[PDB]
Each structure stands twice: as C-alpha cells, then as structure tokens.
Amino acid sequence: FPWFGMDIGGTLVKLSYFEPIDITAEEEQEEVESLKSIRKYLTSNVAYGSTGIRDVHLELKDLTLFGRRGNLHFIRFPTQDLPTFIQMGRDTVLCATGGGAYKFEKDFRTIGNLHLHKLDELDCLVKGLLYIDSVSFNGQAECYYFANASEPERCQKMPFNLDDPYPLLVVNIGSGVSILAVHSKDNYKRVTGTSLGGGTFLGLCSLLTGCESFEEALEMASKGDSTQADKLVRDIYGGDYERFGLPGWAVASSFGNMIYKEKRESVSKEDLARATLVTITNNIGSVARMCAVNEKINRVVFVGNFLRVNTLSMKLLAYALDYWSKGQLKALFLEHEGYFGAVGALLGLPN
Amino acid sequence: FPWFGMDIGGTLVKLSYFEPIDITAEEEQEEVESLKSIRKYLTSNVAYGSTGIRDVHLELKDLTLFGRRGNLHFIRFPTQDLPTFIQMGRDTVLCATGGGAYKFEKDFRTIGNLHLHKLDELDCLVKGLLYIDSVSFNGQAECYYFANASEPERCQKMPFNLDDPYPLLVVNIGSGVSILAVHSKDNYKRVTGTSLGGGTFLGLCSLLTGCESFEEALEMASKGDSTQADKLVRDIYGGDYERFGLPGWAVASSFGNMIYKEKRESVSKEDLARATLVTITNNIGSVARMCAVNEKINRVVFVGNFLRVNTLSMKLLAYALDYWSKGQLKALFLEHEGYFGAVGALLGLPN
Numbered sequence: 240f241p242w243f244g245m246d247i248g249g250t251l252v253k254l255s256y257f258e259p260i261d262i263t264a265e266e267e268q269e270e271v272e273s274l275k276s277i278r279k280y281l282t283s284n285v286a287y288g289s290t291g292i293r294d295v296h297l298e299l300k301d302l303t304l305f306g307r308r309g310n311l312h313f314i315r316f317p318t319q320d321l322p323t324f325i326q327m328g329r330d331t332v333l334c335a336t337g338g339g340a341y342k343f344e345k346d347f348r349t350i351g352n353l354h355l356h357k358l359d360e361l362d363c364l365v366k367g368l369l370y371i372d373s374v375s376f377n378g379q380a381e382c383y384y385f386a387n388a389s390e391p392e393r394c395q396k397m398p399f400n401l402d403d404p405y406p407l408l409v410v411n412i413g414s415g416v417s418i419l420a421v422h423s424k425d426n427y428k429r430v431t432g433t434s435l436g437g438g439t440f441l442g443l444c445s446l447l448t449g450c451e452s453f454e455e456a457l458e459m460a461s462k463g464d465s466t467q468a469d470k471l472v473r474d475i476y477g478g479d480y481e482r483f484g485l486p487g488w489a490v491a492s493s494f495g496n497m498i499y500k501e502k503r504e505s506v507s508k509e510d511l512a513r514a515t516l517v518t519i520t521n522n523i524g525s526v527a528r529m530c531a532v533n534e535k536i537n538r539v540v541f542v543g544n545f546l547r548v549n550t551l552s553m554k555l556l557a558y559a560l561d562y563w564s565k566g567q568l569k570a571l572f573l574e575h576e577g578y579f580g581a582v583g584a585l586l587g588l589p590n
Numbered sequence: 591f592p593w594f595g596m597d598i599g600g601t602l603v604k605l606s607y608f609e610p611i612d613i614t615a616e617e618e619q620e621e622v623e624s625l626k627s628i629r630k631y632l633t634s635n636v637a638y639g640s641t642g643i644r645d646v647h648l649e650l651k652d653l654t655l656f657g658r659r660g661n662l663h664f665i666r667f668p669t670q671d672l673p674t675f676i677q678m679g680r681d682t683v684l685c686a687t688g689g690g691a692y693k694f695e696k697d698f699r700t701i702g703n704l705h706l707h708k709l710d711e712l713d714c715l716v717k718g719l720l721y722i723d724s725v726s727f728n729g730q731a732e733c734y735y736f737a738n739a740s741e742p743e744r745c746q747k748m749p750f751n752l753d754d755p756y757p758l759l760v761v762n763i764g765s766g767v768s769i770l771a772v773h774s775k776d777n778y779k780r781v782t783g784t785s786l787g788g789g790t791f792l793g794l795c796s797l798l799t800g801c802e803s804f805e806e807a808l809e810m811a812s813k814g815d816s817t818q819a820d821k822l823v824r825d826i827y828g829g830d831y832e833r834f835g836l837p838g839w840a841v842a843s844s845f846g847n848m849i850y851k852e853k854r855e856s857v858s859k860e861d862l863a864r865a866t867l868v869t870i871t872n873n874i875g876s877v878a879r880m881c882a883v884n885e886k887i888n889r890v891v892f893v894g895n896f897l898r899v900n901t902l903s904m905k906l907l908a909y910a911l912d913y914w915s916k917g918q919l920k921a922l923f924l925e926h927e928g929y930f931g932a933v934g935a936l937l938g939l940p941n
C-alpha cells in the first residue's frame with residue numbers, strides 16, 4: 240500500500256505522500272495495478288479534481304524514510320471536499336490526524352479494507368516540524384526569519400538554524416490558533432490559544448468586501464491602508480502616549496474609526512481587508528509575545544496556512560515581536576507552512 | 591469656580607461635577623452670576639444640548655470632598671462634540687485627563703482665564719476606582735460579581751467587598767483596552783493591552799449590520815446566535831477535543847463559518863452582531879485570564895464603557911473566567927462603569 244499522512248483540519252486537508260524511488264525489478268511486478276494507478280495519478284498530476292493542489296515547490300527529494308528512498312510530496316484540498324477523496328479511494332493503513340480524523344471516521348470506514356490510525360493534532364505538529372527541520376529543505380534551511388525586521392527597506396528573509404531548538408514557542412495559525420511551549424521532543428504544553436485566527440481573517444473579509452477566497456482577500460489587503468479603518472493612539476492623544484510608551488502610530492482601537500458614518504462612507508474594501516489582516520495578525524503577535532515572555536522563550540515559530548503566501552502577515556509579526564521587545568524576541572517561520580501535522584501522522588505508520 | 595474632573599477619551603468625554611450643598615448665606619451672595627448659572631444649568635437638566643447625558647442613577651449624595659459637602663454628578667458626551675462644550679464655556683481650574691487633555695489643549699486655552707491641569711489617564715483610573723469604592727455607592731457596594739457564574743439560571747449579580755484589594759487586575763475596556771496590575775495605591779503597571787476593544791465591537795457591527803449606535807448594536811446582538819457565524823470545536827472534531835480539554839461547544843474559529851458562501855447567505859445581522867460581541871468579549875477575557883494567572887492575581891475587575899448597560903458581555907466574562915479557571919479566578923465589575931478617570935482628575939484639584 241502507499242504511504243500517507245493526512246491532517247484533516249477545520250478548513251483544509253493536508254496530505255503528505257511518500258513516493259518510493261528505489262523499487263527493484265521484483266518489486267515492480269509484485270506491485271498490484273491498483274497501487275500502480277494511485278502512484279501514477281499522484282505523481283503525474285499537480286491538480287486533482289477541481290480543488291486538489293500538489294505543492295511541487297515543497298517536494299523533498301531522495302529522502303530515506305523507514306529504510307526506503309523516495310520523494311516526499313505535499314498536497315492540500317478543502318475539508319469540505321473530503322467525500323470526493325473517499326469516493327476515489329473506494330471506487331492500506333491511513334494515519335490520520337486533525338479534527339476530521341474523528342469527525343469523518345465513519346466515512347473513512349466505507350473504504351472496505353482501510354485501517355484508520357488516529358493521531359493527535361498537536362503531537363503530529365511538533366513531530367513533523369522537528370523532523371522536517373532535521374532533514375532540511377533539499378540542503379537549504381527549513382527555518383527562516385526576517386533580518387533587520389524593524390527597518391522595512393532593509394528587512395530580508397534569512398535562514399535560521401534550529402539545531403538545538405528548546406525551548407521554542409510554536410504558534411499554529413490555522414482556522415484557529417494553538418500556542419505550544421516545546422521544552423523537548425516529548426515534553427510540550429499547549430499554553431493557550433485564540434479563536435481569532437485564519438478563519439476569522441477570511442470570514443470577516445468576505446463579509447466586509449465580497450472577496451470569495453483567501454488569495455483575493457490578500458490581494459485587496461495589499462492595496463489597502465489599515466489606518467483608514469483603525470483609530471490610532473495619535474487620534475486620541477494628538478501624538479505619543481509617552482508615559483506608557485505607546486507611539487502615536489500604534490493602533491488604539493482596531494476598526495475604531497468605523498463608528499463614524501462619514502468614515503464608513505469613505506473607507507474602501509481594500510482598506511477594510513488590510514485592517515482585517517492587521518487586526519488579526521497583531522492580536523496573535525501580541526498574545527505570542529506575552530506567552531514567550533511569560534514562558535521565558537525568546538524564539539517564536541509561527542506556522543499554519545494563515546501565513547501561506549502571506550508576506551504581509553509574516554513581516555508584521557517579525558516587526559511587532561522585534562520592535563515591542565527591543566530585539567529580545569525573534570519571529571521565526573518554516574518553509575513547509577501548514578504541512579507538519581500531516582508529516583507527523585505519516586511518521587506514526589510503523590506503530 | 592465649579593469643581594470638574596474631565597476624562598477626554600477616544601470616544602466619549604466623561605465629566606464628574608461636584609455640586610456643593612452646604613452653601614452659607616455669605617457664600618450665596620459672593621457667588622457670581624456666571625457661576626450660579628452653570629450650577630443651575632448642570633443640576634436642572636439631565637440632557638445637555640443634543641448629545642450630553644447626565645447619569646442621574648449614579649449620583650453620589652452628601653459626599654464630603656475637600657472639606658465641603660455636596661453631590662457628585664456623572665456626565666458623558668461624545669468627544670466629537672467637545673467644541674460645543676468649549677463654546678459654552680467661553681460664550682476656573684480644569685483637571686483634565688485622557689488623550690484629549692493633550693490633543694485639545696489649544697482648544698481649552700480659547701477659554702480666556704482657564705488653567706488646564708493635565709493628569710495621566712491610568713493614574714486617574716486607579717485613583718478614581720479606589721476612591722469610589724472607599725466612599726460606597728450611597729451605602730451599597732460599588733463592586734459586584736456574578737454569583738454561580740457558570741450556571742446561567744442561577745447566576746446573580748451580588749456585592750463584592752474590595753476593602754483590601756491588592757493585588758488586583760484592572761481591565762479598562764474603552765475604545766481600546768489597557769490591563770493594569772495594581773499592587774498598592776501608588777504601585778501599578780500596565781501589564782499589556784489590546785486594540786480589539788469597544789471601538790472594534792461597534793466599528794465591526796456598524797459595518798456588518800448597518801446599526802448606527804452602541805445601543806442598537808447590543809439590541810441586535812440580544813436576538814442573535816453567534817454559533818451561526820462561528821466555527822466551533824465540534825464542527826472540526828465532531829465533539830470535544832479531549833486531550834487538551836476543549837469542549838465541542840468552544841469557539842474554534844471566530845466568524846470561521848463565514849468562509850462558506852451558503853453560510854454567509856443564511857446568516858442574520860443579529861447573528862453577526864452577537865458574534866462580534868462574543869468575539870471581542872472572549873478575546874479580552876482570554877487575555878485578562880492569562881495576565882491574571884501570570885501576575886498571580888485572582889480578582890479581575892473589568893471597567894469602561896464597553897460594558898455599560900451590557901449584561902451579555904459582563905456575564906460572558908464572568909462565565910469565561912470562572913469556567914476556564916475552575917473557580918480560581920473571579921470577574922468583578924463596578925457600578926460607576928467608565929467614570930473613574932474623570933473622578934481621578936477631579937481628585938487632583940488641590941495640587
């Protein structure tokens with residue numbers, strides 16, 4: 240059977256698949272036509288059905304896993320569309336994590352000779368993260384930060400070495416947000432979380448702007464000025480609030496200028512998309528910053544698909560952590576985005 | 591001259607005025623007609639112009655302040671409308687706090703023989719709070735909580751004694767939010783804050799629903815079901831996420847069901863108003879809860895006008911703190927709402 244790890248989240252299904260590349264002659268016969276057709280379907284297409292996507296650029300090549308050489312592939316689709324995945328399967332051991340491993344268990348069981356092995360969402364995240372960092376992204380670093388994050392003509396994505404990571408704060412920004420303090424490979428706690436996550440960003444954006452996808456929401460946002468919606472400290476003070484170090488440019492009240500009819504009539508969709516992005520991102524950064532200080536952790540890794548192709552949010556997080564802590568905290572990011580749970584699930588297979 | 595403390599905030603001006611009631615005969619002559627007309631205007635009307643409001647129900651009677659007996663009055667109006675206040679004045683020592691004490695300083699100076707004494711916003715909050723609690727609300731407690739907050743047929747506003755308050759966490763929810771750890775009368779720090787405050791509630795509500803006032807936003811909210819907009823843990827898991835104690839009913843992603851077109855078409859304005867309220871309130875409660883635990887403080891007092899006539903938010907805060915901490919934390923509230931800074935300013939007069 241084929242090697243999968245599946246993370247069925249509240250918005251997206253993440254699927255990691257190990258394509259073997261060391262198949263001997265005696266192994267190519269012994270392979271059944273059903274297995275050969277799944278292998279070929281997966282590796283010959285980068286789009287599956289109407290909403291499945293293979294992220295070719297993330298592929299890990301010539302990896303050795305469980306004694307075998309192969310390539311590790313990364314595939315996502317909407318959770319919504321999982322019934323089509325299951326139909327395909329029925330028309331193997333599946334290591335499955337995320338909420339949908341439980342919610343859709345009965346649906347997986349419609350695949351006749353399928354054994355579902357449920358694994359914990361945050362266990363898999365941490366195992367996946369550490370594993371991907373340990374193998375590298377084809378020789379390049381999996382982890383990166385933004386050098387000189389507080390100077391935005393100078394700010395640059397640069398590699399960061401995670402070889403002795405502990406203690407690490409891990410902020411997983413998906414539909415919602417879990418924040419973990421990882422003290423060793425086997426010891427971590429969920430310190431806190433927030434329901435104001437990626438789902439809140441797109442949920443509010445769609446309602447405010449009429450955008451119909453994540454990508455369109457980011458595009459509107461890129462053209463927007465969040466200070467049109469937001470009431471700033473200088474709007475209240477006429478400058479800095481010196482005593483408590485709040486510069487005039489800091490947001491006093493997110494969307495707070497939208498209490499005035501005149502302002503609501505002059506604000507653009509793009510402005511509201513950007514304010515939504517800024518509000519959700521800064522809130523998360525503010526909570527992470529607080530957990531870091533309280534846990535005595537100076538490196539904070541943000542992951543999950545809220546940040547996928549989202550440089551606005553990543554740089555804002557890097558800036559916010561660096562500025563407000565005067566360099567004591569560093570925001571870190573990982574090239575494999577939101578796929579760690581799926582990898583972690585896959586790593587559970589020999590058990 | 592008349593005794594005022596004024597807190598000019600990002601949304602509302604709060605004005606505390608001390609009406610003397612022990613005026614001798616030799617003092618009633620010596621009083622100039624201008625002073626007599628301001629006194630009479632203030633005390634004979636409960637509405638001033640089109641947007642000024644006197645909160646009669648909050649009046650403290652027969653208070654002794656600075657050697658004099660009087661009644662302490664509480665008055666608010668939109669900051670927006672401050673030019674009309676100033677016109678009245680010019681058409682005295684003013685102790686002024688909040689951001690607008692700085693922003694509008696030049697405007698105050700148009701009142702010919704006015705001395706403006708600027709005081710710090712959070713200094714005045716703490717001084718005012720402690721003072722109002724120490725004098726009582728006409729024999730009744732200024733501070734209260736919700737007894738049995740986690741059982742909502744049993745939940746009841748009950749008086750709470752603040753006679754030895756320290757340490758206390760103070761959450762000031764106005765346009766934005768400041769969170770203070772108060773360790774004695776003179777020693778406190780601003781531990782953190784959030785820009786997702788009262789202004790965010792009404793700002794987003796107005797944009798989402800077409801409501802044109804705070805009160806209308808609460809009224810829509812009262813009729814709404816926030817679980818229509820919000821994606822719950824049970825929507826992801828099909829039940830509880832047991833391992834990390836997240837019951838199926840907890841919000842996984844605020845507004846997270848609004849990523850689906852079908853859902854956006856079936857959701858009501860009332861549902862969105864309630865989801866806005868729930869999202870803003872729980873986020874604040876979640877941050878306060880975290881600061882309390884980290885500061886080793888078990889009483890959290892929430893104040894500010896976000897909570898004015900807002901039992902939905904107060905009970906949700908009381909429930910959230912009690913439930914998620916298993917009784918270790920108590921949410922507290924204060925009868926004088928958002929007026930503490932204005933009182934604190936007034937208390938600065940003899941300096």
Ligand SMILES: Nc1ncnc2c1ncn2[C@@H]1O[C@H](COP(=O)(O)OP(=O)(O)O)[C@@H](O)[C@H]1O
Pocket residue numbers: 247248249250251252337412413414415436437438439440441453543544545546547577
């Ligand atoms: N193609 C996409 N479709 C839907 N959401 C996306 C997409 N790309 C990025 N996102 C963002 O990613 C978030 C989901 O992240 P993910 O880590 O997969 O979490 P979950 O396990 O909750 O699905 C969404 O809330 C959204 O903000």
Ligand SMILES: Nc1ncnc2c1ncn2[C@@H]1O[C@H](COP(=O)(O)OP(=O)(O)O)[C@@H](O)[C@H]1O
Pocket residue numbers: 598599600601602603688763764765766787788789790791792804894895896897898928
């Ligand atoms: N009559 C009102 N007009 C405007 N906002 C109100 C009113 N009543 C309650 N509010 C709420 O009170 C908040 C302002 O609280 P306040 O403590 O006066 O803060 P600030 O000093 O920022 O003005 C608003 O953001 C709103 O949520």
Ligand SMILES: CCCCCCCNC(=O)CCNC(=O)[C@H](O)C(C)(C)CO
Pocket residue numbers: 248249338360413414415416417431432433434823826831836840841842843872875876877879910911914
């Ligand atoms: C004092 C108020 C305290 C309120 C505490 C409840 C806040 N809510 C949360 O932490 C859930 C956030 N969401 C998540 O972690 C994730 O979406 C998962 C559900 C794990 C699925 O990926």
Ligand SMILES: CCCCCCCNC(=O)CCNC(=O)[C@H](O)C(C)(C)CO
Pocket residue numbers: 472475480485489490491492521524525526528559560563599600689711764765766767768782783784785
């Ligand atoms: C790592 C990200 C850290 C981000 C830190 C900035 C967050 N913003 C704030 O705390 C301001 C909230 N607002 C207020 O406190 C009040 O409205 C006042 C401006 C005092 C006027 O009453």
